[PDB]
Amino acid sequence: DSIVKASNWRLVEVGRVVLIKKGQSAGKLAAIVEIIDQKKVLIDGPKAGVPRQAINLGQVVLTPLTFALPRGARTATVSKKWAAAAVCEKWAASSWAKKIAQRERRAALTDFERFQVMVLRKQKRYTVKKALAK
Amino acid sequence: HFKEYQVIGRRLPTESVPEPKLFRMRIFASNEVIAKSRYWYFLQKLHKVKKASGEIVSINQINEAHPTKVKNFGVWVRYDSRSGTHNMYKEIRDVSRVAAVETLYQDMAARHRARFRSIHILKVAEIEKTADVKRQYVKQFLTKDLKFPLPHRVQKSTKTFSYKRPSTFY
Amino acid sequence: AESHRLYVKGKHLSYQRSKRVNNPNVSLIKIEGVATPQDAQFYLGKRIAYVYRASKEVRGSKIRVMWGKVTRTHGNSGVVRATFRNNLPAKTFGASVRIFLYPSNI
Amino acid sequence: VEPVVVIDGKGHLVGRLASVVAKQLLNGQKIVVVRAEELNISGEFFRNKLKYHDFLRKATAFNKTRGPFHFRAPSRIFYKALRGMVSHKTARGKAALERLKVFEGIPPPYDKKKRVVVPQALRVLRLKPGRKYTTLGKLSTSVGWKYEDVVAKLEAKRKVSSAEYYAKKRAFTKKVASANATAAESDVAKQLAALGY
Amino acid sequence: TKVSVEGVNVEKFNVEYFAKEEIKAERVEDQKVVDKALIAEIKKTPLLKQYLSASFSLKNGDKPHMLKF
RNA sequence: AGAACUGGCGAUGCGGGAUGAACCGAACGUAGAGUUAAGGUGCCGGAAUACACGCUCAUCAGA
RNA sequence: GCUCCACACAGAUGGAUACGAAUAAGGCGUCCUUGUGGCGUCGCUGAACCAUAGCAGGCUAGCUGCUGGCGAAUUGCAAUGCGUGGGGAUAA
């Protein structure tokens, strides 16, 4: 049997959902509408609020998720297939969006709320240390 | 960064010469003053005038029609060199007229060492129907369902010390 | 129990200088976890202390302190300009400097 | 942010690494580079072999014994690349270099202790894919250093003694992952998650 | 984090109260009367009593330009 | 090589060009604060191992 | 070095928090057909992890794991709070 594996990648494609690192959008999802060249893609996310623009692929990181979308699809057509595939649910269900949300949630804790975290982590420790050494 | 300007001039009307021919041309420049300056330089090449003899009638910006649609720009360019001047045609797949001429100036600097003063932009025109695309590297992206990866991603660390040994998958 | 720390700890890098001239009045301070001028804007006006052991006991303590202020940012890294009452000794280029949280904007 | 910052040359670039290690000293930041030998440069081998020998023909006239002492041992090969950016004369320097410790391989008492890497100096993060690039090791060997072997062997041994470790550990954190996985869900938990934890 | 304060009678003491010309009994009585009228509202919210007994410090990783107080 | 013309040094520090009669910036009471020039920001070296488009492998690249 | 007398006193501030190899690839978990095996899952920064409450951290009662009982001031509105100079004994 021929076992040639794997070289699994995130391909740039018409209908690839992306996450923007740098820019005014910053941490908001868009989809690759049409590839311009090696370095530039044309993106839009009508639900997130990110406008339609040419963007360098250094500005943006790709995500594991995709959906079927025609080449050079307009904002309204993007919105239709976006809602049909339901990629926001597919996004938030992942461990990845959960990590970003966790960083954001920890960033806006009150000093008293941080004290609460401390007290509860003492309690959780006691239950775990009980379960061990048995 | 650039902007497109519509400049018209008519060599100030004298006695028994009422309202001359009005030479119209589209200029790419960073600002309004540079656009005027470049306009006089082109008039003096096409015919015999001077800056004092003429007048800028109207200088207006031309915004691009659909800056949400990917186009194929076939640009004709004349440019000076170490040797005598010579015509050229290149092809750029881009969004706007302004972004197309921008990337052309960067490419002309890269491959030919020609600065802004050396370059004349003859005529920028779209290519609507495919198979008129004479260049290979523009035709390269025009295939059905182009799906390619961007492997070996350079991830910028803000800190100087990483603790993981970075694994550049994509 | 462990932490009694009410200060952000940052290293004393150098004096404000060119290639060939240094002004010893204005000291340059790297602060921990500060990457941009925008993050450093928070630390502007906060009191600084350089704390060190000395040989002779002065006031029932073998430890002396030089006090000062952050004045402004210095470049894109979050390195910060700082003027003390008595200038820092230049022997301290790469020594820990305690940046406090008073006076508070927040 | 850590009294000592043991670094691991393995897959770095003499110059960049160095440099960054330099700055870190002049700013009171003890350091300790390891696995020195398994360092990296740029450009074919035959290269670094020249851009060195030249550094070898050096030597002083009348008395070759008082001139540019050509150290073979990598650790050193690299230590130079560094003392080259550090006034290494004015006390401010001496004070530095005095803050360094480049070892070939990874001898105690570090072996047992975490290390790191300077993401801004990795062959795999600076050199355009498939492109010639030395490996000190050979380079040293080719020009003296008489131990590449010892470390070599005397190395693999270290990796063992450890690898074995990890297991024990990995096999340990396999429990925890469960301990919590189970002790998870409960209450006290839920709450935390809310706040983030 | 705010508490209820409207039950407390603060208006007795001002600038002149803190003159010095071993601890006076008048100062101790003003302490207890106020503090009992405050303790009652601290007991409402969970862990707030324990929060006030604790001491603030900046741990390794606490960047005050990021921290929301 | 010679002739004419206007500057620079001569009687002139200072920032920069690694270093300098001929380059670049800038004509100086003593200071404090702010902003810049010329030149630069891997480190020595104060300042972005900034961002973006391309190009270049050299057996002593190149700056 | 042992003994007897006399004297002298380049920058800590929660924790360096241990796999190796590869990067056009890798971890971690599971099933085993023990494999360059299958299934699942992770990365997109350490923004983590572990530690973290008490006079700069007390004194006492039970069931900082949980519940208690006391003390803090007046520090006054900031000023961090291990060699000598001689003996004796024995190795050189």
Q: Please return the burial class of A114, using the count of CB atoms within 10 Å of its CB with bins 0-12, 13-18 and 19+.
A: middle
Distance CA D166, CA D143 (A): 37
Cβ-based contacts of B163 with chain D (< 8 Å): 114, 116-117
Q: Which among A121, A128, A132 has CB closest to D197?
A: A121
Q: What is the dihedral of CA C8, C12, C13, C19, to 10 degrees?
A: 130
Name the residue in chain E with its Cα closest to that of C78.
Answer: E65
Nearest nucleotide to D1 by CA–C1' distance?
Answer: G16
Q: Quick check: A131 and D179 CB within 8 A? A: yes
Taking an 8 Å cut-off on Cβ atoms, the answer to whether B161 and D116 are in contact is yes
Give contacts of D116 with chain B, Cβ < 8 Å: 161-163
> Looking at the C1' of nucleotide G27, which residue has the nearest alpha carbon?
B167
Q: Is D124 within 8 Å of B166 when comparing Cβ atoms?
A: yes
Angle at B91 between CA B88 and CA B96, to 5 degrees: 120
CATH class, range B68-144: alpha beta
Q: Do C93 and D26 touch (CB under 8 A)?
A: yes
Query: In terms of Cα–Cα distance, which of A33, A13, A37 is closest to B107?
Result: A37
Q: Which two tokens stand for residue A45?
A: 């996310």
CA distance C106 to E66: 12
Å separating the CA of residue D188 from the C1' of nucleotide G66: 14
How would you class A120 by CB atoms within 10 Å of its CB: exposed for 0-12, middle for 13-18, buried for 19 or more? buried
Q: Which two tokens mark C72?
A: 């402004």
Amino acid at D41: I
Report how many domains make up chain C.
1
State which approach was used to obtain the coordinates.
Answer: cryo-EM
A57 in Cβ contact with A40 (< 8 Å): yes
Q: Phi and psi at residue C2, in whole multiples of 5°? A: -85, -55
Which nucleotide has the shortest C1'-to-CA distance from B102? F53
Distance between CA E48 and CA A5 in Å, rounded? 57
- Looking at residue D114, the DSSP 8-state letter turns out to be -
How many angstroms separate the CA of residue B163 from the nearest CA in chain D? 5
Q: Structure tokens of C63?
A: 């430890």
What would the CATH number be for the domain defined by B1-67? 3.10.20.10
Flag whether residue B69 sits within 8 Å of chain A, measured between CB atoms.
yes
Residues B146-165 as b or e (16 or more Cβ within 10 Å = b): eeebbeebeeeeeeebbeee
Q: How far apart are CA B158 and CA E56, in angstroms?
A: 29
Element (H, E) at D91: helix D91-95
Residue-range definition of the domain harbouring residue C72: 1-106
Say if CB A82 and CB A90 are below 8 A apart. Answer: no
Fold entry, domain D148-197: 1.20.5
d(CA C41, nearest CA chain E) in Å:
8
- For chain D, what are the domain ranges? 1-147, 148-197
Neighbours of A74 (CB within 10 A): 15
Q: Which CATH number belongs to the domain containing residue C53 in this structure?
A: 2.40.10.190
Q: Are A34 and A72 within 8 A, CB to CB?
A: yes
> Is the CA virtual torsion A72, A49, A24, A31 positive or negative?
negative
Q: Would you tell me which residues 80-119 of chain A have a C-beta closer than 8 angstroms to some C-beta of chain E?
A: 107-112, 115-116, 119
Cβ within 8 Å, pair C32-D1: yes
Instruction: Tell me the nt nearest to D26, Cα to C1'.
Output: G10
- What residues does A42 pair with on adjacent strands? A34, A54
Give distance CA E34 / C1' G69 (Å). Answer: 21
Whole-angstrom Cα distance, residue D85 to residue D82?
A: 6
- Which nucleotide, over all strands, has the C1' atom closest to the CA of E47? G53
B-chain residues near D34 (CB < 8 A) = none
Of B17, B70, B60, residue with least CA distance to B39: B60
Helix, strand or coil for residue B167? coil
Q: Report CB contact under 8 Å: D27, C32.
A: no
Residues of chain B with CATH 3.10.20.10: 1-67, 68-144
| Residue at minimum CA to C1' distance from nucleotide F41 | C75
Chains A and E touch (3+ CB pairs under 8 A): yes
Through-space separation of residue E53 CA and nucleotide G70 C1' in angstroms: 14
Decide if B39 contacts B49 (C-beta within 8 A). Answer: no
> A10 vs B170: CB contact, 8 Å cut-off?
yes
Residue in chain D closest to A131 (alpha carbons) equals D179
**For chain D, how far is it from start to end, CA to CA, in angstroms?**
24
| CATH topology assigned to domain D1-147 | Ribosomal Protein L13p; Chain: A; (3.90.1180)
Residue A35, beta-bridge partner list: A41
Question: Which CATH number does the domain housing residue A85 bear?
Answer: 2.30.30.30
Residues of chain C with C-beta less than 8 angstroms from the C-beta of E61: 33
